[PDB]
DNA sequence: GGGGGGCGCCCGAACAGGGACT
DNA sequence: GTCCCTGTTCGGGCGCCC
């Protein structure tokens, strides 16, 4: 088969990230894998004058005796020369299958073959790092569905007209998969999918809450209660233009102790009626534009909770959500955030097919050292580490 | 020999050429080094002699090897270099000897004149044009001196390696440059059979492992370190006496310091890091701190101990033991069984501005981790003086994601704890002082200060001052004043930020003054409030601060 | 004495991103 | 906008290995 020429976007150069160091269990599985994709054509063993580099690690899936490469093609993604259905968002069940195989059956442009370089350390480095390349469309890079689209279409293609009201899309290596069927023919459904799919070679997105703030409820109110109070509104009225805070902050005159009760006047209290309704009504105005970044900001909130909001122009949040957990010993803040991510990442893609970039609150070395040990999907968000200003935390606590 | 190994293609970058730079002088000595030299690799084809259609040339030199009677051949192709295309270097750190399980029979060989076994792409030959003053050659081979030269090297090693390490999947081959330890479970005499086997597949490929260099009983040799059967152990360190120190007498003492403590428990370098702060050169002299002063002297002890280091069983656990030094220090001893170490370390990273204790150690348990995973591949077991109950508070308060890997206490002190706990709720019967800072951007004159309910004000004026620094200024303004139990209400997200991170050091002067009242209280509650929106009395300190 | 690649350690220079202010 | 303050990368010395 012919390959199709690719391109760099102009004034770019290929990847050149440095391997980071990765577990026993990971490099032997990789060291296991890439023997075999080597014994298949899938890779060739390449020198260092090759300049090129892009990081590689491993998944061990579920409960599995399998291992799944995972090459972060982050970068090169983002330097390679550049329909999503509406319908899907709303679905009692979607499965999420992993179509990368079919990949390795398109040969890659030899041109670009080379910007694709990756390389596998030795434990306690014992040798020089062994250097691969592609020879096929990699899983992960961004180019690999695109070019077997066509290909892609050909085979759903009866599946669908057999099956025109369950909704199949592909983003990267996954395949969603919709449908109103109850489970169970929801289910036999997917396998047939399955089936259809080896012959050529679960989520629930209506039940997704949305995160409203919220206003405390009280018989007592001291002084410092409405001053947490007025300030949480002053910055709600960035987002929601709708709130008023001047007879609240009338009761704050004078210079008075923080624990004096206050008894609210009717006027101050009828506002509070309204600022809590004004948090009802949905954020007006918020168009979701495909020319820039979806961000997600995550904040810690205690106890296991986590919120977020995704935003793509500061207070115009597209949505904004909550992400709950065990409450105990064994909590790994880590874990439950990378978690947080990965059911977030899930929820974008599902709703506008696109990836987030996050702004995480965790320092850059804890979360460098421990994600890849409780990720589980087969792409990788964009992030970038951000130490969040401790008043945000209390805007969203719930 | 050269090896038939397939060339490594390289180019220069894009509308470079070669190296035009004349040769320099070279000592008598050295020409004759030289040319005892080249007139052997010239009659091995390992370089040839070129003519008038060679216009490049690079300027070469030599040094005395380790065996002190041998001289080796450089040059300084800096200029080639930079005209050179990228690689990508395959050698992505150091083996060290705390990572090798125990071996029934070991054996340690150099490769013979290395690179000189390697021949060098053709294209590229004609840009290696040297001359030796008393002839012109150039090189057919990889010189050593190129930037291309150690990557194309070690590829090349690996290449020649892989259908003997297939063969022989259960020899271990630790290759670093043309040192070779090879490993093995075998009885003497079939493991010396095994050896032979790999010096005949090496001398197939034209390299020679000649027997001067082979190593056939312990203890051996290697990277630095000797190779006992049941222990290793670093060759000798030897620190500097000088009396007069300069930066780069200085710099070379941190190096042999930080060199030693991966196997000498309890070394320490802040004091004499401090030094080299603001030296604008190598050869800026320096006087020794009394702090310094001391603590060369402690690691100076230390050195005189006997230690080693055993080798590791991957059997049993890895446990890593961490513990305080002081000034945000930190030294580390992992372990499989008590007492024998694998190995050490230390941690002394100022990061932050502003920082506390819990945070150092969940960046010390952060470094041990990434390199327990190179050298073993997995991660340790801690032991770290920090209670489950303190962890756990500080875990609660703290707005990020932060965790530390399976550990147990130890009351080994001095045990890590927070010097200071903010409260959640503010104090009943505290007096509450609002307090606020302003500064003029042009002149640099502030003022900070503070209203309080029982009526109290107070203003105090500053000169070459921020405003951040005057909304800190006013906060400890507050402190001074205020009894053993404060409410403090600010409208500073700077300052509150700071503050709310519970820190007990810091690099300003000025928040290590408000971090001692905060350990001096019994109660301490700060609120925040957005400024200038009339909320009373943050409006009235306002008034007062605002007279700029 | 003048060269090279790797890792480590410290430092200061550069530059990025958020807050407060004119 | 600018100024201030804080965090990152990155290059420069030195240590060790070959
Ligand atoms: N200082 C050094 N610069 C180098 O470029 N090298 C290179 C990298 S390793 C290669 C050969 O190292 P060796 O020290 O075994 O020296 P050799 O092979 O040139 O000669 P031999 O092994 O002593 O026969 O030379 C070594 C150095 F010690």
């Given at each position: ?40 054509g ?5 020198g ?8 590689v ?32 968002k ?7 299958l ?74 990267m ?5 919709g ?11 997917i ?25 405390p409820?009280?018989?007592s ?74 961000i ?83 792409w ?12 945000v ?6 | ?22 040769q320099?002088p ?22 040839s ?25 450089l ?32 054996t ?32 057919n ?37 043309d040192?070779?330890?090879?490993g ?19 001398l ?20 630095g ?11 000798p360190?030897?620190?500097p ?40 050169a190598?050869?800026?002299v ?13 690691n ?13 069983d991957?059997?049993k656990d ?24 694998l ?16 945070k ?7 470094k ?50 927070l ?65 053993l ?30 971090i001692?009242?905060?350990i ?6 700060l ?12 409006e ?9």
């Amino acid at each position: 088969i012919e390959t199709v020429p690719v391109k760099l976007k102009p004034g770019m150069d290929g990847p050149k990230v440095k391997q980071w160091p990765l577990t026993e269990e990971k490099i032997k599985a990789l060291v296991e894998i890439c023997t075999e994709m080597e014994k298949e054509g899938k890779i060739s063993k390449i020198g260092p004058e090759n300049p090129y580099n892009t990081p590689v690690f491993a998944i061990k899936k579920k409960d599995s005796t399998k291992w799944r490469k995972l090459v972060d093609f982050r970068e090169l993604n983002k330097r390679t020369q550049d329909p999503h259905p509406a319908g899907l968002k709303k679905k009692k069940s979607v499965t999420v299958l992993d179509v990368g195989d079919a990949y390795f059956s398109v040969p890659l442009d030899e041109d670009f073959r080379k910007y694709t370089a990756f390389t596998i350390p030795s434990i306690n480095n014992e040798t020089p790092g062994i250097r691969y390349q592609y020879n096929v469309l990699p899983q992960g890079w961004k180019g690999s569905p695109a070019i077997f689209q066509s290909s892609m279409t050909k085979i759903l293609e009866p599946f669908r007209k057999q099956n025109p009201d369950i909704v199949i899309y592909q983003y990267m290596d996954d395949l969603y998969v919709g449908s109103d069927l109850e489970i169970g023919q929801h289910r036999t459904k997917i396998e047939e999918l399955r089936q259809h799919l080896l012959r050529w070679g679960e989520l629930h997105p209506d039940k997704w809450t949305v995160q409203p703030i919220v206003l405390p409820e009280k018989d007592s109110w001291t002084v410092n209660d409405i001053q947490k109070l007025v300030g949480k509104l002053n910055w709600a009225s960035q987002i929601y233009p709708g709130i008023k805070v001047r007879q609240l902050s009338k009761l704050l005159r004078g210079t008075k102790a923080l624990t004096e009760v206050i008894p609210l006047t009717e006027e101050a209290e009828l506002e509070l009626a309204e600022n809590r309704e004004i948090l009802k009504e949905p954020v007006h105005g918020v168009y979701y534009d495909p020319s820039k970044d979806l961000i997600a900001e995550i904040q810690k909130q205690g106890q296991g909770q986590w919120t977020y909001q995704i935003y793509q122009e500061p207070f115009k949040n597209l949505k904004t959500g909550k992400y709950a957990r065990m409450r105990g010993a064994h909590t790994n803040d880590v874990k439950q955030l990378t978690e947080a991510v990965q059911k977030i990442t899930t929820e974008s893609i599902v709703i506008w097919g696109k990836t987030p970039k996050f702004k995480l609150p965790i320092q850059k070395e804890t979360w460098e050292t421990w994600w890849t040990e409780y990720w589980q999907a087969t792409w990788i968000p964009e992030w970038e580490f951000v130490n969040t200003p401790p008043l945000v935390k209390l805007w969203y606590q719930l | 020999p050269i090896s038939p190994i397939e060339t490594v293609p390289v180019k220069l970058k894009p509308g470079m050429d070669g190296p035009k730079v004349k040769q320099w002088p070279l000592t008598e000595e050295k020409i004759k080094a030289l040319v005892e030299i080249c007139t052997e690799m010239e009659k091995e084809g390992k370089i040839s002699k070129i003519g008038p259609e060679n216009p490049y040339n690079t300027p070469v030199f030599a040094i005395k090897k380790k065996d002190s009677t041998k001289w080796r051949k450089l040059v300084d192709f800096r200029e080639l270099n930079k005209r050179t295309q990228d690689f990508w270097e395959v050698q992505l750190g150091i083996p060290h000897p705390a990572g090798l399980k125990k071996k029934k029979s070991v054996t340690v060989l150099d490769v013979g004149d290395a690179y000189f076994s390697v021949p060098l792409d053709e294209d590229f030959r004609k840009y290696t044009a040297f001359t030796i003053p008393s002839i012109r050659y150039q090189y057919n081979v990889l010189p050593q001196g190129w930037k291309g030269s150690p990557a194309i090297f070690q590829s090349s090693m690996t290449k020649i390696l892989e259908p003997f390490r297939k063969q022989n999947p259960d020899i271990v081959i630790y290759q670093y440059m043309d040192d070779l330890y090879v490993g093995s479970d075998l009885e003497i005499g079939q493991h010396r059979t095994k050896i032979e086997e790999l010096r005949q597949h090496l001398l197939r490929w034209g390299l020679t492992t000649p027997d001067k260099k082979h190593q056939k009983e312990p203890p051996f040799l290697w990277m630095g370190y000797e190779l006992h059967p049941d222990k290793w152990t670093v060759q000798p360190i030897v620190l500097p006496e000088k009396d007069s120190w300069t930066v780069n007498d200085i710099c070379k003492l941190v190096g042999k310091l930080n060199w030693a403590s991966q196997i000498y428990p309890g070394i320490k370098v802040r004091q004499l890091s401090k030094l080299l702060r603001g030296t604008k050169a190598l050869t800026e002299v320096i006087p020794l701190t009394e702090e310094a002063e001391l603590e060369l002297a402690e690691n100076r002890e230390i050195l005189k101990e006997p230690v080693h280091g055993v080798y590791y069983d991957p059997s049993k656990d890895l446990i890593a033991e961490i513990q305080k030094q002081g000034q945000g220090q930190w030294t580390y001893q992992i372990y499989q069984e008590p007492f024998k170490n694998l190995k050490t370390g230390k941690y002394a990273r100022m990061r932050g501005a502003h920082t506390n204790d819990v945070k150092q150690l969940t960046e010390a348990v952060q470094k041990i981790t990434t390199e327990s995973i190179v050298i073993w591949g997995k991660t340790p077991k801690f032991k770290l003086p920090i209670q489950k109950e303190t962890w756990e508070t500080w875990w609660t308060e703290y707005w990020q994601a932060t965790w530390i890997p399976e550990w147990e206490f130890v009351n080994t002190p001095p045990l890590v704890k927070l010097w200071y706990q903010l409260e959640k709720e503010p104090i009943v019967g505290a007096e509450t002082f609002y307090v606020d800072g302003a500064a003029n951007r042009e002149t640099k004159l502030g003022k900070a200060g503070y209203v309080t309910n029982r009526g109290r004000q107070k203003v105090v004026t500053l000169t070459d001052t921020t405003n951040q620094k005057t909304e800190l200024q006013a906060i400890y303004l507050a402190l001074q004043d205020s009894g053993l139990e404060v409410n403090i209400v600010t409208d500073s997200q700077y300052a509150l930020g700071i503050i709310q991170a519970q820190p007990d050091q810091s690099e300003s002067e000025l928040v290590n003054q408000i971090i001692e009242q905060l350990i001096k209280k019994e109660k301490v509650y700060l609120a925040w409030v957005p400024a200038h929106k009339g909320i009373g009395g943050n409006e009235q300190v306002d008034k007062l601060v605002s007279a700029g």
